[PDB]
Design a protein around this ligand. Structure first.
Ligand SMILES: Nc1nc2c(ncn2[C@@H]2O[C@H](COP(=O)(O)OP(=O)(O)OP(=O)(O)O)[C@@H](O)[C@H]2O)c(=O)[nH]1
Ligand SMILES: CN[C@@H]1CCc2c(ccc(O)c2O)[C@H]1O
Lengths: 231, 329, 281, 51
């Protein structure tokens, strides 16, 4: 008869501890770091710092937890079903490797990620790394994007572009062509449930930890707006 | 080195020579089991996130479960109250096991480590490392040795006391997703992502037979109570029953109105009923000897990922992504 | 005649609220913090449609109150209680949506299943405090001769009140929970427009009416149903011989119909559709 | 590829039985143990610990 009382006491203690654990579980936001080789992923994670890997960083009293997977590396991805409850996916792609094709492989990987059945409601934050190697290759470079990407010939600069001051039109055309080549895949089958947030980054950049914060806030706000039939 | 095609043709012809008659022809005058209706008896709550695995105890009373919030909870089915709750170092776990002696619990996950816990001492007792890919399943062969399957297309037979691999099994091409042990624990089967299942010898460490029925990834595998047959479930919405002695399949279980994947497979005590979990938010009950549906187990609000039947065959438990466990009877 | 219309109104009020309550109770996927306020609102509407509408209809048709004075006072108390508890819940729902949208990173901490019960109980206490307390006590009674004459008799049950109560109850019930709702929904509309502008700027080349339609429906039904009555309520007390009794009762009954529209507005999500299809279908 | 050829050779020399005998054995086992599975045959509620 006392066994039931002891079991009930243990149950009460366990539920009491679970009550405390639930608060911290709901407080934190989880991110997944996913990028191809030579992207510059290690530099990006190192600058945010200042078979698995975990990183803690807090911005304005909000707990963000980011995961990097390196132990399981294969063309086939079966573990990706485990990440259908994350807030966002961080995609890192090397913008200057359009001839070393690596850019086409990254585009194929992005297309495969976007159309997965378990990632229907997950947004993607896109980082287009290596903004200075690309500028060096474009300005007075032997190689040209025309041969590797024939679609570049009939591409015109959008009238809504906001170039950084002092940069040439050619690098702007190249950058916007590369960005729109991803936006085209993003917009095809979005259905309004998830979007893509493209960015331009480099080695000397100090606002990425704030960019992730802003993008996650926008993601949550848009989700809440859509749930109530207002967007 | 092109002679392998001749060997495969010879094996196929030898298998086709033994096909005297189908299983349906043999089992045609047996009266059907009829409609089987089960209702939920217990519901267990306390997991903050989705559930990936469970494993019944050998006493048909206690059971263990794992969730993505990084926690293992040992339940008490009779009185639906918790007994233990073990926090985990890494929150991504894909499997769990319960020792036959009831003294240990194992768990593995996306980190390439299998951890065991001493229940009657709850602290970590050993950590097994050496796999280069994520773990998919693990089963206690004894109180001192455990067999595990990983995502680097290998299986190993570990030694808990020393922590070093004793035997390594190779031969699959794709990821290994599940395994099951024979009742006498002499041979075990496994199902890979190359749509093939193999039979392994524990003591010798070599592959005895190979089965090539399915056309997609095999997610679940189970073993017949007799020990001379086994069943597998794949993504093409079909379950197939193979046979060790005959060396080919005997029957397929599929319906034209279902197109979802299969996540779990289990048998009953007599082996007459085959229970399989699907992605359609529910579970199906089959007739092993006639290939006819005999019931539906509905009530889960998310996909079913776990399934198990007690040693005495008194009840069946299902776990789902809704973070709830249900007991059916 | 009118009996068929009144019976249809009673049936429509009862059926939807009972269905919503049972749907929330039976399925565990609907047990959300937001669905507790809807449960309280449905309880208030069901109580009103099952308690005050039938007896008011009988009093209108018979043209004579056939119950004692105590039952007349009890009926008036229940009427005021339900009316003032069915609007503060709408205010609470609006504030919850405000917090969910404008503060996305702190919504989980701000609202908890423990705090929702406290808010609901406080709402119901403040609601019932203004209804039973000054009506069971005779503080709301009027002074002119018609009021005293009707109070003396045991066959007439009419609403006679002084200026102070007619202003205070109206301010508590309607005017305070209106400015809050207006401000909240204006801010929500601004946030929706701001997000839509960002989407258009970012990806408009490849590719504010839904928000306008939804907010228009939500605000318009409530304002149209309950606004005229809570103006004529002050009016007929400020100056006499201005509002006839028939118009007063007509506008009051127009207000009652708002209880039949809440399930059609707050329970239109696909999850509620699936729940309604699973049972009784 | 020598290992693959050796493995195919090993798995081709085995003793196989006709599937009629296998089906008969399965049916015999299922019929023999048919009375001792509570799921298939509903036992009385007195012996059910989940009631
Ligand atoms: N100039 C320039 N160099 C960069 C940038 N991002 C990364 N790199 C350099 O690229 C080199 C290789 O990248 P790492 O970050 O070291 O690693 P990785 O080879 O990209 O592979 P990961 O470890 O997956 O990133 C490093 O030495 C970086 O300094 C950039 O934006 N501009
Ligand atoms: C008899 N009908 C009553 C009369 C006055 C009144 C109502 C509702 C809310 C109030 O705050 C009131 O003062 C009406 O329902």
């Amino acid at each position: 008869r006392n066994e039931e009382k002891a079991q009930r006491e243990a149950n009460k203690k366990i539920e009491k501890q679970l009550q405390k654990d639930k608060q911290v579980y709901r407080a934190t936001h989880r991110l997944l770091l996913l990028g191809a080789g030579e992207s510059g992923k290690s530099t990006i994670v190192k600058q945010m710092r200042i078979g698995i890997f975990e990183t803690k960083f807090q911005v304005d009293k909000v707990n963000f937890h980011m995961f990097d997977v390196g132990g399981q590396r294969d063309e086939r991805r079966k573990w990706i079903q485990c990440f259908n409850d994350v807030t966002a996916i961080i995609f890192v792609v090397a913008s200057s490797s359009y001839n070393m094709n690596r850019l086409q492989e990254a585009l194929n990987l992005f297309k495969s990620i976007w159309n997965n059945r378990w990632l229907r409601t997950i947004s993607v934050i896109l980082f287009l790394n290596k903004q200075d190697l690309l500028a060096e290759k474009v300005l007075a470079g032997k190689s040209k994007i025309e041969d590797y990407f024939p679609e570049f010939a009939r591409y015109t600069t959008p009238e809504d572009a906001t170039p950084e001051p002092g940069e040439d039109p050619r690098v702007t055309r190249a950058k916007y062509f590369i960005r729109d080549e991803f936006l085209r895949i993003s917009t095809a089958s979005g259905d309004g449930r998830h979007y893509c947030y493209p960015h331009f980054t480099c080695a000397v950049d100090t606002e990425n930890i704030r960019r992730v914060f802003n993008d996650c806030r926008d993601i949550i706000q848009r989700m809440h707006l859509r749930q109530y039939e207002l967007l | 080195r092109q002679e392998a095609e001749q060997l495969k043709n010879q094996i196929r012809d030898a298998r086709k020579a033994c096909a005297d008659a189908t299983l349906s022809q043999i089992t045609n005058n047996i009266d059907p089991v009829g409609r089987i209706q089960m209702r939920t008896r217990r519901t267990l709550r306390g997991h903050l996130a989705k559930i990936y695995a469970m494993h019944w105890g050998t006493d048909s009373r206690l059971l263990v479960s794992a969730s993505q919030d990084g926690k293992l909870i040992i339940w008490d089915s009779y009185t639906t109250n918790k007994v233990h709750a073990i926090p985990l170092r890494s929150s991504w776990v894909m499997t769990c096991a319960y020792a036959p002696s009831g003294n240990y619990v194992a768990c593995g996950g996306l980190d390439n480590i299998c951890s065991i816990y001493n229940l009657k001492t709850v602290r970590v007792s050993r950590e097994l490392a050496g796999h280069t890919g994520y773990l998919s399943c693990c089963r206690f062969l004894d109180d001192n040795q455990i067999v595990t399957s990983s995502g680097d297309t290998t299986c190993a037979l570990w030694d808990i006391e020393t922590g070093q691999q004793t035997t390594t099994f190779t031969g699959h091409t794709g990821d290994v997703m599940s395994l099951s042990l024979a009742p006498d624990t002499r041979l075990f089967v496994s199902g890979a992502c190359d749509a093939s299942a193999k039979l392994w010898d524990v003591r010798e460490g070599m592959c005895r037979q190979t089965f090539t029925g399915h056309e997609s990834d095999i997610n679940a595998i189970c073993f017949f109570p007799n020990g001379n047959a086994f069943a597998t479930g794949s993504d093409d919405a079909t379950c197939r029953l193979f046979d060790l002695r005959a060396d080919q399949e005997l029957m397929t279980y599929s319906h034209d109105n279902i197109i979802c994947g299969i996540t779990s497979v289990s048998f009953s005590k007599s082996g007459r009923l085959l229970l399989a979990g699907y992605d359609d938010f529910n579970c199906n009950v089959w007739d092993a000897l006639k290939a006819d549906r005999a019931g539906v187990l509905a009530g889960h609000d998310n996909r079913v990922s776990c399934l198990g039947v007690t040693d005495d065959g008194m009840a069946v438990a299902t776990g789902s992504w809704d973070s709830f466990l249900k007991i059916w009877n | 005649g009118m009996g068929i219309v009144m019976s249809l109104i009673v049936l429509a009020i009862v059926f939807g609220n009972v269905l919503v309550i049972t749907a929330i109770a039976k399925f565990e996927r609907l047990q959300t913090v937001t669905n507790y306020f809807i449960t309280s609102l449905a309880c208030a509407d069901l109580v009103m449609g099952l308690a005050v509408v039938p007896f008011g209809a009988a009093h209108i048709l018979t043209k004579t109150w056939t119950f004692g004075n105590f039952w007349c006072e009890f009926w008036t108390s229940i009427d005021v209680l339900c009316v003032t508890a069915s609007i503060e819940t709408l205010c609470v729902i609006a504030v919850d949506r405000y917090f969910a949208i404008t503060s996305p990173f702190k919504y989980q901490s701000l609202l908890t299943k423990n705090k929702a019960r406290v808010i609901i109980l406080m709402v119901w206490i403040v609601s019932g405090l203004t209804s039973f307390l000054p009506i069971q006590m005779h503080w709301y009674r009027a002074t002119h001769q018609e009021a005293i004459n009707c109070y003396a008799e045991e066959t007439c049950c009419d609403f006679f009140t002084n200026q102070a109560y007619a202003i205070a109850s109206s301010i508590v019930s309607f005017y305070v929970p209106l400015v809050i709702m207006v401000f909240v929904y204006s801010r929500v509309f601004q946030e929706a427009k701001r997000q839509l502008q960002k989407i258009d700027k970012s990806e408009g080349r490849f590719h504010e009416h839904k928000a306008l339609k939804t907010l228009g429906i939500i605000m318009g039904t409530f304002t149209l149903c309950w606004l005229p009555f809570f103006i004529v309520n002050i009016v007929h007390v400020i100056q006499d011989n201005l509002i006839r009794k028939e118009v007063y009762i007509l506008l009051n009954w127009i207000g009652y119909v708002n209880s039949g529209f809440n399930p059609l507005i707050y329970c239109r999500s696909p999850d509620f559709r699936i729940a309604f299809q699973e049972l009784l279908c | 590829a020598r290992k693959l050829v050796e493995q195919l050779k090993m798995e081709a020399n085995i003793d196989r039985i006709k599937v009629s005998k296998a089906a008969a054995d399965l049916m015999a086992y299922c019929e023999a143990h048919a009375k001792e599975d509570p799921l298939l045959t509903p036992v009385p509620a007195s012996e059910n610990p989940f009631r």
